[PDB]
């Protein structure tokens, strides 16, 4: 649907809180998610003749978008492969789809991380926006222990209107991000 | 059948399956099966969604358990880096901490034989 929980939560709960905390004059000054770009590194797939198109069609279930097939820009003998035919797997989420993804991630996925004490509170640093990376991709509901074969982690960058990480920290913590105080 | 975090037994008699947890052996296993009142001869294959939750209830709530059990012992070995007790060292030199003969074996605490030697006797 064109409406989801978090989306509602943002408007009818967080929006105001922030206007009250930091005293914004204009609706637009009030920070808002921009996007959540998620990406997998994949140092293999190159070699062992590995098609490994297993990861995108899989990823597509969790993110809800067919991911995009990213490739190496230099040649590195040291670290293998030569520009081009190379490997990496990246998807960009905005609007509803962005929301549905975070909804599930926060409300479900981070729960069944192996350890967990909260998300690292040093991954904005002024440079608004927040990064974190994961190890197991089966922590999401859609992924099952049957489906897996290799445990491919991922990086999650989440980008915002906030120009300082003060006001960005608030936004995420209030949207339901558990931070490791 | 993922009771403890990254841990999932299957298609084996549950009694020993539960062994396949760090922090759970034959003892804490049988102990839990009577208290949940379930036949251990039965497999993880087959059971009610109720049986499953009933089991993970009792277990995960009682004691601990991979992760923060594992993380706990470490902090205890860590604390033996106080001013530095005897058990503190031996942990510092990776040697037997429990009063043994280093002169010969100890290989379990010492990675396989670093033969490294060049001793001499008479040439002329």
């Amino acid at each position: 649907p064109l409406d989801v929980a978090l989306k509602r939560k943002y408007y009818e709960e967080v929006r105001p809180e922030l206007i009250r905390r930091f005293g914004y004059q204009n609706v637009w000054e009030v920070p808002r998610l921009e996007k959540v770009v998620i990406n997998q590194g994949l140092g293999e797939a190159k070699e062992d003749a590995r098609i490994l198109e297993k990861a995108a069609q899989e990823l597509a279930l969790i993110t809800g978008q067919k991911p995009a097939v990213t490739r190496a820009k230099k040649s590195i003998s040291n670290f293998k492969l030569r520009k081009g035919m190379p490997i990496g797997l990246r998807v960009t989420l905005r609007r509803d789809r962005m929301w549905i993804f975070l909804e599930k991630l926060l409300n479900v996925a981070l729960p069944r991380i192996r350890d967990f004490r909260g998300l690292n509170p040093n991954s904005f640093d002024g440079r608004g926006n927040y990064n974190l990376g994961l190890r197991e991709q089966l922590i999401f509901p859609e992924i099952t222990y049957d489906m897996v074969d290799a445990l491919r982690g991922m990086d999650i960058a989440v980008v915002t209107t906030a120009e300082t990480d003060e006001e960005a920290r608030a936004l995420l913590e209030l949207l339901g991000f558990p931070f490791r105080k | 059948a993922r009771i403890a975090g990254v841990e999932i037994p299957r298609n084996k008699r549950v009694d020993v399956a539960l062994t396949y947890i760090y922090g759970i052996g034959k003892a804490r296993a049988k102990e839990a099966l009577e208290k949940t009142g379930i036949n251990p001869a039965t497999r993880v294959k087959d059971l009610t969604e109720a049986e499953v939750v009933r089991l993970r209830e009792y277990v995960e709530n009682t004691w601990k358990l991979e992760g923060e059990l594992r993380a706990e012992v470490a902090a205890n070995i860590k604390r033996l880096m106080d001013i530095g007790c005897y058990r503190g060292l031996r942990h510092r030199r990776g040697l037997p901490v429990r009063g043994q003969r280093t002169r010969t074996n100890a290989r379990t605490r010492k990675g396989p034989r670093k033969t490294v030697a060049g001793k001499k006797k008479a040439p002329r």
């Binding site: 649907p1 929980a5 279930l61 809800g64 599930k104 | 969604e49």
Partner: peptide
């Protein structure tokens, strides 16, 4: 498509995903 998550912590959440059939071993209520 619209989905229905089911916790072992009783709780049912209403998001949307691929396949509504969802067995969760506890959400962020625990």
């Amino acid at each position: 498509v619209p989905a229905r998550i089911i916790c072992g912590c009783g709780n049912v959440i209403e998001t949307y995903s691929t396949k509504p059939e969802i067995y969760v071993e506890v959400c962020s209520k625990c």
